[PDB]
Amino acid sequence: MKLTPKELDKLMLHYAGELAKKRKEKGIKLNYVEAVALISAHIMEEARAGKKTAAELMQEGRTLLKPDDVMDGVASMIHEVGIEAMFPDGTKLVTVHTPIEANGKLVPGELFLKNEDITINEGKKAVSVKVKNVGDRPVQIGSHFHFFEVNRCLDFDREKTFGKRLDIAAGTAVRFEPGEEKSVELIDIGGNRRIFGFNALVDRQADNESKKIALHRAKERGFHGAKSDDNYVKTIKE
């Protein structure tokens, strides 16, 4: 019966679920491991039966255990239980979000933040810019992307955003639906202000002179808002 190593993985999980249930049967507050295995073993069988759809099990899994069935802490712990099973249409990923509820105090590793607000990008005075997505597709820019070089679709005053980035929490971004128009905040880039990569519009020291070159480049490359060519005076290298 050529059992794959994946199959053995599941066969083991199942008896971890079986144990899990048999314990609840005897009436015993399940724990992190037991709760998860149980939820997992369950979904597994249901997919075997070929009845419940993937979409349905996502939920039905949230009714396998009630707050009084588990130990305090378990709820705050099992944020979610992902699991794969073979449906008549093949294996599919079922994610049972928050299966049980926090009917108790104890919360492992809980955080005790201190109400107050972190002030991001200290002293980097932002600037607002009118931006509109003239294209027919979406466009989302990251927090540290040289704004001046985003999709050539976003129309706006390129000239004004040279050497700047979206003044937002590191790692996040701003979305622009086709047609949408908004005003974004953008501070200047820190460090050595050495802009290399992106759209290849700068690739050097970001200064007022490099700027001239950047606009000229964007201009010829079709980046909406890229000012204009009021007669360029090409340097010895660019």
Partner: protein, 569 residues
């Protein structure tokens, strides 16, 4: 010259010319196109059979004597579907034909001579194919290997450094040091390996160093920033080192749209992963790229085939990932601008059309490294059930279509990454990575995996029993999986540059080490049975897919073959 019936003959030597086999529980029927044997002289091993001293086995072999003969095997390969003996010598497929003892049998090339030094492997009734080659692997966990292996895959190409976020997001092994770790780690496994480096850099020096360090190519990925700069720079260095480049398109369209990405590629060769879009890439018209000449279209495992559950499933993965919320609109937008059920269904059909060429996995990151083969055949089954046989099909079979899909995970990935000369198809001169399939379980569960000319993994029973058949019968490591044997049987691929710089001796690598080549002169036209080019558009509003004017789409399915029938889970 007495004669015998076909029913009988086939239970002794297996199907012969004109006969047909059903592939697994699918509707795909294959027909034996030719037979090199000589009715009456076929090879058989056993108690009183033909392979014995002075008889089939020569007492005066040729000085090319085989180390192993797979008798009466049905070879399914893009080169054809036929009957013939396979000869194996020095880890390489030494011959495909009659073979036996010239001393007692007519027509037997000396590259197929059977002597006291050759071992016997019965293949009658079985189908032999080359090992599979998954080229979109995330080296997230080493446990993937024995999984992909058990599934008929002998070669994994990808990137990473283990369960690190960078790896979980991208198939990249960054920098020469991390390349070292992985190459040295690879010594341990039973699976040819190749690694991709971080192409997400506009620094030429850093770009070539990773190749000089051992990488078979670059990988540009979104999470690392797939910009037209990075794209452009990477490609140039890729051209110099004759190595391949894979890419994950800029979904957020922050740098530009698919139009720009192409301009970036400047017409140079490219391996596009999950070209469809679900696995990632330009929203929502990335799938259009798979129609250009210079592109090597590849689809990612998950959205294949298109089942009534695939749409629901994905939305979940995409949400469980990326940190998306149901109450946030920008979050629901991205989800809908990426998981287009339209471009998904349009995929299954694109494969059938030869538009798409390679089938990957995308292991541990929106991909199932153990179901690439299984799913490649499921899809083929669907498309037949919905579109019927093929126009190109000749005769009352599915041979052509069969080769179409096989090529998708054998010869096509092999070429896309310059390792076609050594592996990727059942042909003389190539490394002997062969997997024996028992017709019923075809495409799902294989009989045994032979790595580098020696058995590395096979179904095995109670190690205490009086035979290998009794239960339990799972996949047990064979001899080519242990000791120093693994080293002779496996290959870690590298670039010419590194190979030439002595990267092997450099890292104390005891594995056979070959370099990749001919990666810069290949196009969509080099993809076997998947060379169809075309100007394909994609509706910005309805996310509908149009090709050459018309529009393509497939209907989801409620049931697929090669599934619940064969596995307990």
């Amino acid at each position: 010259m007495k004669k015998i019936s076909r029913k009988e003959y086939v239970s002794m030597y297996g199907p012969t010319t004109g006969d047909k086999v059903r592939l697994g529980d699918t509707d795909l029927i294959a027909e034996v196109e030719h037979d090199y044997t000589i009715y009456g002289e076929e090879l058989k091993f056993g108690g009183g059979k033909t392979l014995r001293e002075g008889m089939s086995q020569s007492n005066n072999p040729s000085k090319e004597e085989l180390d192993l003969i797979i008798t009466n095997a049905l070879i399914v390969d893009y080169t054809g579907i036929y009957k013939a003996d396979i000869g194996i010598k020095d880890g390489k497929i030494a011959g495909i034909g009659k073979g036996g003892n010239k001393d007692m049998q007519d027509g037997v090339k000396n590259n197929l001579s059977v002597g006291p030094a050759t071992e016997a492997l019965a293949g009658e009734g079985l189908i032999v194919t080359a090992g599979g080659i998954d080229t979109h692997i995330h080296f997230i966990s080493p446990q993937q290997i024995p999984t992909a292996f058990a599934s008929g895959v002998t070669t994994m190409i990808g990137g990473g450094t283990g369960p690190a976020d960078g790896t979980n997001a991208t198939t990249i092994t960054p920098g020469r040091r991390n390349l070292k770790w992985m190459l040295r780690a690879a010594e341990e496994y039973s699976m040819n390996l190749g690694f991709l480096a971080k192409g997400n850099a506009s620094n030429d020096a850093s770009l070539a160093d990773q190749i000089e360090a051992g990488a078979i190519g670059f990988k540009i990925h979104e999470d690392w920033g797939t910009t037209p700069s990075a794209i452009n720079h990477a490609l140039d260095v890729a051209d110099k080192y004759d190595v391949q480049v894979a890419i994950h398109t800029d979904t957020l369209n922050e740098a530009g749209c698919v139009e720009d990405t192409m301009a970036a590629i400047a017409g140079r060769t490219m391996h596009t992963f999950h070209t469809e879009g679900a696995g990632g890439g330009h929203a929502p018209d990335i799938i259009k790229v798979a129609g250009e000449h210079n592109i090597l279209p590849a689809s990612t495992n998950p959205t294949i085939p298109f089942t009534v559950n695939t749409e629901a499933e994905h939305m979940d993965m995409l949400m469980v990932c990326h940190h998306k919320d149901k109450s946030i609109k920008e979050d629901v937008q991205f989800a809908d601008s990426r998981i287009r059920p339209q471009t998904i269904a349009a995929e299954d059909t694109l494969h059938d059309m030869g538009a798409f060429s390679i089938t990957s996995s995308d292991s541990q990151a929106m991909g199932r490294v153990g179901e690439v083969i299984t799913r490649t055949w499921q899809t083929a089954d669907k498309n037949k059930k919905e579109f019927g046989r093929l126009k190109e099909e000749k005769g009352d079979n599915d041979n052509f279509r069969i080769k179409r899909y096989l090529s998708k995970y054998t010869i096509n990935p092999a070429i896309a990454h310059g390792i076609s000369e050594y592996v990727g198809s059942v042909e003389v001169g190539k490394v002997a990575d062969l997997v024996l399939w028992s017709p019923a379980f075809f495409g799902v569960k294989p009989n045994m995996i032979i790595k580098g000319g020696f058995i590395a993994l096979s179904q095995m029973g109670d190690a205490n029993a009086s035979i290998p058949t009794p239960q339990p019968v799972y996949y047990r490591e064979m001899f080519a999986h242990h000791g120093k044997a693994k080293y002779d049987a496996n290959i870690t691929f590298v670039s010419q540059a590194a190979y030439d710089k002595g990267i092997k001796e450099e890292l104390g690598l005891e594995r056979q080490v070959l370099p990749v080549k001919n990666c810069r002169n290949v196009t969509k036209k080099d993809m076997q049975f998947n060379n169809t080019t075309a100007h394909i558009e994609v509706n910005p509003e309805t996310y509908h897919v149009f090709v050459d004017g018309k529009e393509v789409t497939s209907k989801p399915a409620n049931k697929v073959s090669l599934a619940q029938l064969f596995s307990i889970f």
